Design a protein around this ligand. Structure first.
Ligand code: CA
Ligand code: CA
Lengths: 335, 335
C-alpha cells in the first residue's frame, strides 16, 4: 500500500498543522501555503510520474527531481510575465536583505596589470570561485563521466568567458589565471577527483564514441548557455554568488541534469532504445526560458552586445567540439 | 514528433506574447501569469501523466483532466492555510461583484404552508434548481450508467437534505416537492434521458453486481459528501448558485468523476485488474479537502450541528445502500 499509506498519513498531518496553528499573519500564511503546495506537489510527483533512466538509489527520487524540474519550468513561465518592479519585489519578499546589495561588477577592477607574484594576491583566490570551480567540476565529472568531454567543456568555458567579456566585465581574468589555475589546477584536480569518485562508487563511464557531430554540438551549446545564465541572472537581478539563490540554483541544475545527460547519451550512440524522453526536453526548455527571461529583464547588457561575437563563439565551440570528437574517436580506435 | 511539435510551437507563442505585450498593470500581469502557468501545466500533463481507464475520445484528454484534478487538489491544500479575510479578498479579486452579495438563506422563507395549488408558484420552479436537477442527473446517469444506483442516489439525496436541514435552512422543501418533482419527475426524466443517451452513443452499462457491501457504501458516502460540499461552499463563502464558481465547480467535478467511477468499478467486481489507480485516490482526497476547508472556514454552521443526525444519516445511507444492493442482486439473479 504505497499510495494508501502515503496519502492518508500526510493528509492527517496537513489537517493537524492547518487547524492547530494560527492564521493572523498574512505573509506567513502565504509562505506556509507555498511550502505545503510544493510538498504535496512532490508527493503527487512521487505517486504519478515516469520513472526515468536511473533506478539505483531509488526510483522515487528521480520523480521528486522531475517534479522540481516542472515546478521550476512553470515558475519561469510565470516570471516571464511580470515587470522588473514586481520581480524585484518578489526577490525582496524572499529575502529582505537583498534590498541593500550592489553589483560585484559595477564598482570593481578586473584584469589589472598582471605580472606581480607577491603572495598578497595569490592566496586570496580560494574564497568563492575556486571552491565553486573545484567542487562544481567534481559534480560535472559525475554528470558527464569522461575525461575528454569534461576537459573539452573546461576549455570551452574559458573561450565563452573571453567572448562574453564585453557584457559582464567580470569574466576578465589574467591570462596567467585562466590557463594555470582555472584550467590546469582548479578544474583539473576537480575532474580527477570526480572521476576517481565515479570509479570508486560503482558507476558507469560514458563514451560518446554521423548524427553525433551535431548532437554533441547541441549538447555543448546547451551546457554553455546554462553555465552562462548563472552569471546573467546574477548580473541582471543584483545579488552575490554566496546568496542562497546562486548556489541553490546551481545544485538544483546539477540534480536536474543528472538524468538529462543519461537520457541524451541513451538517445545518442547505443544502437538501441532512442527517442529521448521528456526530462531532456524539459531541461532544454528550462535553459531556453532562463535565457529568455534574462534577455527580457536585462535589456541593458544585451543593448550593447556585438553580433560579431555571438555568432563567432558558436563557431569556436563548434570547432572545439569537432576536434574533441575526432580526438576521442582516434583514441578509442587506436587504443 | 508529439513533444517536439507541442513544446516548440507553444514556446514560440509564449515568448511572442510575453515580449509583444505591455507590463504596466500589475494585477493584469499576475492574471496572465496564472493563465499561462495553468496552460503550460496542462501541456506538461498531456506530455507526462498516466493514460487512465478511458481511451475512446482521446487518451490525451484524460491527462488534461488529471492535470486539472491535481491543480484543484493543490489549490485546496493552499486555501487550507489562509484565513477568512484572505480567502474573501481572493474571491473579490476573482470577481469584484462578489463584494455585494447576500446569502439566499439568511433572508428567505422556506417550507411555507404547502397546500395551495395556484399556478403562481408551480411554474416558478424551472429557474435554476430544476435545470440543475434535470441536466445534472443526465450527467450523473452518464457517470454511473445504471437505473438502480442512480435512483438510489436520487432517493438518498432527499434523506441527506432532510437530515442536514438544521445547518442550511434552505434544504427545507415541501413534502409534495421532494417526492413528486425532485424524485419522480425532475430527476426521473433526467435519469431516463441520460440512460437513453448512454445507450444511443455506444457506451457500456455497469452492473455493480462480499467486499461490495462496504465498497458501494463508501462510494455512496463520498458521492453524498461531494454533493453536499457544493451547498456548504455556497453558504460559507457567500455567493449564488448562478455565479460561475458554482456551476464551474459542478462541471469540473463531473469531468473529474467520469474516470474515477470507472476506476472504482474496475477495482470492484471484475475478477480482474484491481488495486484502483491514482485518480480515484486524488478524487477522494479532493472531496475530503473540500469538506475540511468548509469545516475550517465556516465554523458557525457546524457550531450548532447535532451529532444525533451526523451519525444517523450514515446509518440511513447504509440501509438504503444495502437494500439497493440486495434488490439489484435479486433482479439480476431472477432475471
Ligand atoms: Ca575562468
Ligand atoms: Ca431535493
Amino acid at each position: 500500500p504505497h499510495t494508501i499509506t502515503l496519502l492518508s498519513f500526510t493528509i492527517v498531518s496537513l489537517m493537524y498543522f492547518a487547524f492547530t496553528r494560527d492564521d493572523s499573519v498574512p505573509e506567513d500564511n502565504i509562505w506556509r501555503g507555498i511550502l505545503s503546495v510544493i510538498f504535496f506537489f512532490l508527493i503527487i510527483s512521487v505517486l504519478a510520474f515516469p520513472n526515468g533512466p536511473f533506478t539505483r538509489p531509488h526510483p522515487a527520487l528521480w520523480r521528486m527531481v522531475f517534479g522540481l524540474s516542472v515546478l521550476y519550468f512553470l515558475f519561469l513561465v510565470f516570471l516571464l510575465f511580470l515587470n522588473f518592479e514586481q520581480v524585484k519585489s518578489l526577490m525582496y519578499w524572499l529575502d529582505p536583505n537583498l534590498r541593500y546589495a550592489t553589483r560585484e561588477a559595477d564598482v570593481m577592477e578586473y584584469a589589472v596589470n598582471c605580472h606581480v607574484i607577491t603572495w598578497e594576491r595569490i592566496i586570496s583566490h580560494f574564497d568563492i570561485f575556486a571552491f565553486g570551480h573545484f567542487w562544481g567540476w567534481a559534480m560535472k565529472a559525475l554528470l558527464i563521466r569522461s575525461y575528454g568531454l569534461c576537459w573539452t567543456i573546461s576549455i570551452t568555458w574559458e573561450l565563452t568567458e573571453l567572448f562574453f567579456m564585453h557584457l559582464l566585465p567580470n569574466f576578465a581574468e589574467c591570462w596567467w589565471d585562466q590557463v594555470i589555475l582555472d584550467i590546469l589546477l582548479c578544474n583539473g584536480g576537480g575532474i580527477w577527483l570526480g572521476m576517481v569518485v565515479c570509479r570508486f562508487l560503482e558507476m558507469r563511464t560514458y563514451h560518446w564514441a554521423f548524427q553525433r557531430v551535431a548532437g554533441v554540438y547541441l549538447f555543448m551549446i546547451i551546457w554553455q548557455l546554462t553555465e552562462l545564465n548563472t552569471f546573467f541572472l546574477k548580473h541582471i537581478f543584483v545579488f552575490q554568488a554566496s546568496h542562497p539563490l546562486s548556489w541553490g540554483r546551481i545544485l538544483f541544475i546539477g540534480g536536474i541534469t543528472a538524468p538529462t545527460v543519461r537520457q541524451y547519451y541513451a538517445y545518442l550512440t547505443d544502437t538501441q532504445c532512442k527517442r529521448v524522453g521528456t526530462q531532456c526536453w524539459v531541461f532544454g526548455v528550462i535553459g531556453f526560458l532562463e535565457a529568455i527571461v534574462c534577455i527580457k529583464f536585462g535589456q541593458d547588457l544585451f543593448s550593447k552586445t556585438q553580433i560579431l561575437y555571438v555568432v563567432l563563439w558558436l563557431l569556436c565551440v563548434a570547432f572545439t567540439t569537432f576536434l574533441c570528437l575526432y580526438g576521442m574517436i582516434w583514441y578509442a580506435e587506436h587504443y
